[PDB]
């Protein structure tokens with residue numbers, strides 16, 4: 711499913727991502743835009759052999775199991791395919807554990823390079839929340 715900007719913002723707010731660990735809702739919508747283009751079925755291969763999955767491109771090297779990343783961890787205790795669902799519940803709960811691991815939203819390279827230090831509130835402007 712390809713989410714809409716306000717549709718995703720409302721869905722993320724319902725799952726408690728607004729101001730979660732200090733990151734306003736605009737940060738999560740901005741990151742989802744540049745990580746997956748609002749597409750839940752987005753996948754991308756990394757050089758080390760791991761794969762990024764879902765609306766937030768959560769890495770299989772640490773967070774999910776895809777059966778093809780030897781020596782990796784499954785810290786969110788889920789198959790990586792659950793991150794490709796139209797229900798973002800899995801990706802949000804795993805994102806909450808990622809953003810709490812000490813590095814904040816810097817875990818998402820697209821957020822640090824394209825959202826950090828910008829007016830992220832513009833990503834939720836005009837949305838009914």
Ligand SMILES: [Cl-]
Nearest residue numbers: 734735736831
């Ligand atoms: Cl915001």
Ligand SMILES: [Cl-]
Nearest residue numbers: 777778779780
């Ligand atoms: Cl694996």
Ligand SMILES: [Cl-]
Nearest residue numbers: 721796797798
């Ligand atoms: Cl949903």
Ligand SMILES: [Cl-]
Nearest residue numbers: 732813814815
């Ligand atoms: Cl932080």
Ligand code: NA
Nearest residue numbers: 770774782783
């Ligand atoms: Na894994």
